[PDB]
Design a protein around this ligand. Structure first.
Ligand SMILES: CC(C)CCC[C@@H](C)[C@H]1CC[C@H]2[C@@H]3CC=C4C[C@@H](O)CC[C@]4(C)[C@H]3CC[C@]12C
Ligand SMILES: Cc1cc(C(F)(F)F)nc(Nc2ccccc2-c2nnn[nH]2)n1
Length: 284
């Protein structure tokens, strides 16, 4: 039972390593080709290639951790490698997820339309706001590193993964909840605008270019939020309840976001979709 489950999870980890490496490499490579072949780069493209680089680093960290654990368990048992892997993972993961929330704040401040004065003050200073969001949220990183190191010291003075995983998962929930709140507020703004443009102005005489192209991105984004909050709840409940196969499952769950969210980001950027179509054209 345990052996076939571990084999299935190993196959899952190999598949998601392949998908994540291919997707994030595709994002970074497309932006790099567009940069070297004399073309303009938007700010969204810079944030996207920052996410791609960070997610390549994170998926390589977890795959290298799995390679070290499988090939050299004696090396894996040491406290030095464990503490080094834990701290490097938490730094890279904090940077990656807060860059994703920064991209979400960029979308929300650029697109959404509200009458609040504070919202407009943030709305006309988007670059300053995302830079401040990256710099201020380092207090979360310092407190996370502190609490993980306290847990490591307590474990080696009493390896306590049942609290390490819980602390890390709590520290991923805050940017996820901020991104979900910004997404819901953007959807509410678009719905209010649609209700306004459906009763004063007779919609359009064309009715072609509108949110009818963005509903595909909204649908493929809300699907990812649903199927990832489900896996949030499943992983937290299973890690809390009784599991003793925690390492491979947690190594699988840590690679889920940087592998699937890049594929979601491909389906939803016009440049990335055009590059994917050109790749599928010249491959044939
Ligand atoms: C948000 C939730 C569902 C997923 C978050 C992923 C976290 C909990 C996972 C992803 C990679 C994992 C690490 C991968 C490798 C090791 C080495 C081993 O000694 C166990 C602990 C440690 C250090 C793991 C701790 C938990 C970990 C950091
Ligand atoms: C692919 C895509 C399309 C759309 C759109 F349909 F609205 F255009 N929106 C998003 N995202 C967000 C929107 C608001 C707040 C946060 C995010 C966010 N969360 N994570 N990354 N960005 N994404």
């Amino acid at each position: 039972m345990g052996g076939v489950i571990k084999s299935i999870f190993t196959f899952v980890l190999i598949v998601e390593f392949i998908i994540g490496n291919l997707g994030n490499s595709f994002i970074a490579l497309v932006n790099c080709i567009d940069w070297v072949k004399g073309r303009k780069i938007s700010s969204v493209d810079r944030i996207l290639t920052a996410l791609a680089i960070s997610r390549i680093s994170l998926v390589w960290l977890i795959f290298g951790s799995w390679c070290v654990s499988v090939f050299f368990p004696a090396l894996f048992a040491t406290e030095k490698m464990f503490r080094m892997l834990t701290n490097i993972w938490t730094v890279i993961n904090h940077f990656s997820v807060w860059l994703a929330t920064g991209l979400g704040t960029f979308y929300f401040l650029k697109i959404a339309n509200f009458s609040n004065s504070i919202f407009l003050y943030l709305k006309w200073r988007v670059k300053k706001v995302v830079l401040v969001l990256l710099l201020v949220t380092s207090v979360f990183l310092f407190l996370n590193i502190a609490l993980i190191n306290i847990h490591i010291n307590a474990s080696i003075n009493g390896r306590f993964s049942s609290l390490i995983v819980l602390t890390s998962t709590v520290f991923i929930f805050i940017p996820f909840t901020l991104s979900l709140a910004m997404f819901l507020l953007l959807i509410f703004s678009m719905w209010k605008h649609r209700k306004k443009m459906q009763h004063t102005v007779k919609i359009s005489g064309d009715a072609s270019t509108k949110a009818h192209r963005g509903v595909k991105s909204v649908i493929t984004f809300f699907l990812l939020y649903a199927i990832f909050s489900l896996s949030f709840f499943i992983s937290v409940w299973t890690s809390e309840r009784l599991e003793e196969n925690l390492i491979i499952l947690s190594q699988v769950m840590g690679m889920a976001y940087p592998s699937c969210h890049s594929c979601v980001l491909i389906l939803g950027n016009k440049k990335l979709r055009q590059a994917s179509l050109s790749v599928l054209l010249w491959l044939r």
